[PDB]
Symmetry: D3
Subunit: 266 residues, 6 copies
């Protein structure tokens, strides 16, 4: 096994539930954490329910962990205060906790929404300027900037994974480009943790899709090559869903419908 | 006069006190704001003392203003709690207040500290990835990202001015590169407000220094050309200050001594 | 199908005759057009005899069509008078007719000859400055520039396909790089018409050749990946043709022997 | 002098009338030509009435000339028929005539309208893809592409001068960026004819304006540096014209109001 | 067979002995050369034992050869005197001998050590500035620069192959990135000699490794696509060698342990 | 004064003679060295005559020096053995001597001839690939590569100055671009030695010429801005010298007539 104990935050969410199962082989003990109720710990599991904005709780959550896959916090556009707590204060707390406990390597769930306002016709490398499509996107930029600072100042290593659409299967036109299969995310995580040297790289979270918009070539040193391809689903999507309207944000902006979100108020 | 009423936040600080005088000609009324006490309003002035973290107060501060020079908030590395209030919550409040009040154009005091970990030998264009040198730098990145989102989503225009060292004169080796004269900041502000179309550009806040590190050429459309030059002060600095050690952050990193800051705690 | 009526111009030529057969499945009605006589319309076909220089005839040719594959005009280096009629006046007439009849999406047969003077050793992206190798190349540049203008001005969408060598199989050394199989051109056409949003992209018209010179990576959003490979024919070429002289334009310039053409006169 | 005989076409137009006077010192004999009547030849002058669409007349116009400043043809957006004659057929005739008479070096009046659809906020180098703003712009692209072909094929040298606004003085907000003074155009012409080697370079035709949009740095080898600056006129513009609306094409697109032109009809 | 006689220098070394066998099919006669003793010539072979520093001997070695695979000289970090003889003087002698004997095309064994000080995280294209990791690396830079000069001055063509680790299989973590299989080196050599036009290209000498650091895309015109992949060996390497320390040169610098070499003295 | 003792090699040559006088103010003692006879040491001078290929002599030459301006060796195209001794072996000896004596900062006289085969129309940044125009140019590349290796391996700092034409005044067409005034070289040297951090930068050795071919912008951190401008001499050059033939290497290649040099034999 890769390590003694691996922490997975956001473990009660759909993706966290997948990781709770798929990542078990990577560690002797998997510690699952979330604010929302977790299914009780089974064999080789520990479960912690805590508020990322509670610094003391996050310290205890991280203590004893050799790596972290951080999926926790707010995962969609919400009012500012929710995002502030889960994704901004929460991120500061996470990095301070790691700094106090041996700087376990972090896989950070960033998001395509950091660059949501780019047109879908534009191919992006990892250094493109952020164009976040809402407060959620801005908060993920915050996590990226904070992680980079901790890397430069303390040596803390983080993979900044800008997740596209990590779902079981592509099911709309945009997902033909953004789909990130479970298998490919799992292999990415394995490659991140196995690397002797990681740094603080931006990683585009997508499978090897023919219609992909993003260039991961500079990540070559990691030896991670995604194997799934959303294009296999194009025919299926055409046969089972209505054609998109060319005016829909779904087929105009990389962030899809998030660009149409207002600023939500509580 | 450029407008009826111009808001200057952070008006009680050193730079704010200068702008309170220098920007008077740009508007019929100058409204000054700060968390801390302000000298009483003279003719053609209004003064308000408020905390940027308080949304109602920020709404009142912005209402009726045709432009904003945003200098307020935390201006150096501090514990996260203080930065959160002044530069994160405070920024969200400022942008919401602007959105509710006619989207007055904003000059935002960002900072060189957003890129503080770059070596001094590296010349930077506006699109370089951020390398913030502490929590203060990360918080200015947050302001930039938030402003960009409000631009793409609502059309709010902001000049993101990455201020170097805006002081009366250069007084150390680093300032031969980073000096931003009062005159040149004033003329930049004039060029920002007069532009029919601004967008949300990154602006490097420095005078025309021979030893400058930053490239503003893509801002040509604004027609702003700084006129002062720190190089004139090299001899004086050499003959009146101790030669820097080559290992000193002051001559190694663009953020200077900020890279040496710890994470300060409350 | 993909549409009610598809127009294919230049349908009497070699490639047009291929497309008359291969594109039939894409529309309920295939309208074939050419300056030259066509084999009579079969079921599900309409045949039109049209001079592209005749604006009224062109208007009638386009009316009722939901899409256009524009192969017609002059296809090799010829005197200016002929190129003017078929590729310059003809293109203006085609774009005006489209503008008057619902702006049917256009696949434009541009040509490698727009960049014919580049050395074969240089890899080209879609934004390279044109280096046309004669009047024919210049006229294809005209088509591209005119199409771009109609896109920016009216939203007319066009795929600018810079065709390599679209033949049944590679038959000389240059085609190991330039070959564009029938199958791959057909799938490109299918991809162009299926896209919710196209724009006015330059597309390099070549199969997936090991020795290809051109980079279509920025077209990723379209989801088109050619499948054939000229490399499979390398041995066959060595066993059927004399070896190229290193001084031959055939192996020195991307436009091959077109660079050796003088200005032909009527 | 610089040569025995210099041809200036379009000599009846406003700019041509200026050049008739300003370029006299460059040649022993100045030959002036236009479709329209010219004021009679004075000493050291020859005057020619010539339709650029007439190949024989064009041949005679060019014969005996050691250099050409090509200002003639259609100078604004007009119907296709007129642009075809003056700027397409006319250009072919001009290049053929030069080819037959010693390849006299050519200064070609191209136009900013070849790139008219770019936003004014974007700084442009000479290699940017064309985005012409109407048929006039498209026709100037044709001139550039044709000139490049004659250069690669025959060695004919041409300066492709993308003229901004060549007027006595800036008179609106856009000209603070696009102004090209008479003096600076004259010195450019002098520099073009003096160069031992020219090639077929794109030259941005603007004075040294603080608010300029265009980058001529790669033309350094020519040793031409404009000296006038539209910025000197900013106050005068504010005191003689209404302030621009931010929605006006005049301040949104590099081609200004040309983007608002429809396709004009005869 | 590609040619009548192919010269392989450095034929007594490990790689040379492999090529002596693998390149036999490329020529009627294989001439093997080395400073050190060679197994006796078989049918279809010639053998010469000579010092590259001796011009007369190098002239005799080259005369009558249609191509050269230059593996000879010093192959690891050594004192300057040895490098000078084999890789500097020896290279000058080789190029002069070629120039005197019909300029037979050369495959030059350059080395990754020309760029050894780059971090393993940085992806390199062929044009990156050299960062040699010792005197051996500097000497291979000398070969590259000399070859380029002979190309520009005389038309001598050379493939500058920056060899990674050309061994039977990968056997440490670095070789997951640098491995260059025998098969892939052989096919590269085949592609180099068959090309009508080669020029003087930099070629990155590696198989198609998932963890590759180098970009050969601009070499597309040659039609060479490596087929082997070091990634297949990762598990074996992990389970049979000690995990690298993150501070080890082996996982920090592209040149691996060579960066740790001192300047060796005689 | 900048330092106790400054070494200037090549001190008997024309440029060294200028530096012997101009650099005196930079050090208490100037040590002059050359292979050729030096005018005897006057006050505050030491003179050493030695062979750069004699390692022991170079050690003694460098001992006790706090900085080196290295102009010595072969300065034009010569037979290989002369260049080998003065510029290759000589450079190794110089760097070993520096390494053994406190790594005094070095100003290295590299040359435009490292890039001599580039066309004069092409603008070059400091990272362009070398295109040396003879053995002399190759030897200067060797010095650059060796210096970079010593920088990376040992921290030795060197300014790699690619000298254009460092003469009293421009006197031909090429010098309008390549001229490097004495004043500007002297100020460059002062800036190099005063810098707390230098690194191993490529520096283009030319004054602020309107017709300059090279981009020094990335050197901004040094605070060196050349003040002279060869353009001031254009009129004078036109009036006092014959026009260049457009076919002359003097006006075609950046290396001028060096491209026409054969390989010289002793």
């Amino acid at each position: 096994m890769a390590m003694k104990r691996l922490l997975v935050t956001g473990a009660a969410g759909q993706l966290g539930r997948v990781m709770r199962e798929r990542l078990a082989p990577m560690a002797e003990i998997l510690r699952l954490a979330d604010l929302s109720p977790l299914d009780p710990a089974g064999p080789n599991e520990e479960c912690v329910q805590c508020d990322l904005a509670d610094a003391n709780a996050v310290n205890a959550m991280v203590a004893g962990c050799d790596g972290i896959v951080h999926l926790g916090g707010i995962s969609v556009e919400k009012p500012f205060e929710q995002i502030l707590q889960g994704n901004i204060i929460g991120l500061y707390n996470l990095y301070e906790a790691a700094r106090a406990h041996g700087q376990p390597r972090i896989v950070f769930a960033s998001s395509n929404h950091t660059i949501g306002y780019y047109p879908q016709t534009e191919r992006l490398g990892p250094d493109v300027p952020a164009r976040p499509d809402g407060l959620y996107g801005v908060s993920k930029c915050f996590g990226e900037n904070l992680a980079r600072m901790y890397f430069d100042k303390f040596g803390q290593e983080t993979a900044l994974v800008r997740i596209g659409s990590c779902t079981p299967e592509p099911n709309n036109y945009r997902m033909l480009s953004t789909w990130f299969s479970h298998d490919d995310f799992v292999s990415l995580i394995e490659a991140v943790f196995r690397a002797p040297v990681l740094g603080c790289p931006v990683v585009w979270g997508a499978s090897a899709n023919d219609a992909g918009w993003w260039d991961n070539s500079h990540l070559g040193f990691l030896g991670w090559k995604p194997k799934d391809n959303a294009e296999a689903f194009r025919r299926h999507i055409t046969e089972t869903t209505p054609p998109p309207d060319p005016n829909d944000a779904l087929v105009r902006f990389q962030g899809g419908t998030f660009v149409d979100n207002p600023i939500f108020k509580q």
